[PDB]
Ligand SMILES: Cc1ccc(NC(=O)c2ccc(CN(CCN(C)C)C(=O)c3cccnc3)cc2)cc1Nc1nccc(-c2cccnc2)n1
Ligand SMILES: [Cl-]
């Protein structure tokens with residue numbers, strides 16, 4: 263495969279995330295970049311605890327990444343090690359890490375700029391996520407776990423959608439609730455995913471609305487203070503929706519409301535979301 267990179271071209275680093283069978287670590291790649299002899303990357307791999315279902319899953323993820331091709335707002339595949347060893351997937355490294363912790367870090371200095379984040383930045387993140395999801399939708403790729411924790415931020419404030427997957431400890435993460443044999447991100451899920459096991463680009467649009475709530479609360483937990491229990495499920499069914507977060511404009515909140523239509527087909531497309539948000543950007547962008 264043309265994606266193949268020699269394993270001995272890597273020096274492995276500090277762990278960036280781990281779950282039960284997988285992890286992602288920082289690494290240095292020699293001779294991988296054509297313009298840079300030495301470069302920092304991120305590498306995904308399995309732990310010795312991993313079984314065939316995991317190895318299969320990681321190979322399947324590599325295949326989907328190659329098939330999708332590149333996009334500015336999707337974490338960028340750089341290579342892989344699949345022969346004569348445990349499988350590694352290599353991507354770009356993103357300077358600021360995940361969007362949740364970045365927003366939290368930025369709470370004190372929020373200005374609404376080198377001095378801190380503004381509404382413009384929040385709208386930029388909103389727009390870039392929509393573009394990334396528009397790209398995935400155009401390849402018929404349904405994300406199923408869209409959330410700010412699965413958005414990375416590169417040094418130029420460029421959003422990169424990912425899915426930690428096996429490199430997140432879903433069994434020990436309050437964002438994932440036991441619902442069957444696995445843990446699911448219930449507070450981000452569309453009702454038809456919760457109740458009917460239906461996942462589509464339209465359920466990704468619901469999750470996108472929840473992600474916007476995360477952005478405009480500077481990394482708040484959706485449905486703050488609400489446990490996922492029978493009362494939660496009844497509330498969603500009865501039509502309960504989150505109120506506008508403090509840094510959102512009325513137009514941004516209108517967008518979240520649209521994304522949370524009970525009927526999936528009534529939710530707006532990621533194409534239209536991208537165009538609408540772009541139109542909300544101020545002149546200096
Ligand atoms: C190394 C590394 C290896 C692999 C990946 N690959 C993915 O995350 C991934 C790619 C494609 C897909 C495919 N699917 C369909 C399947 N799902 C329905 C299951 C999507 O829906 C989809 C498509 C496209 C995007 N997101 C979701 C799923 C997951 C990322 C990283 N990098 C990575 N990962 C985590 C953290 C960092 C990090 C941390 C801190 C600083 N700097 C960097 N970097
Ligand atoms: Cl760095």
Ligand SMILES: [Cl-]
Pocket residue numbers: 456457495
């Ligand atoms: Cl239920």
Ligand SMILES: [Cl-]
Pocket residue numbers: 478479482506507508509
């Ligand atoms: Cl808020």
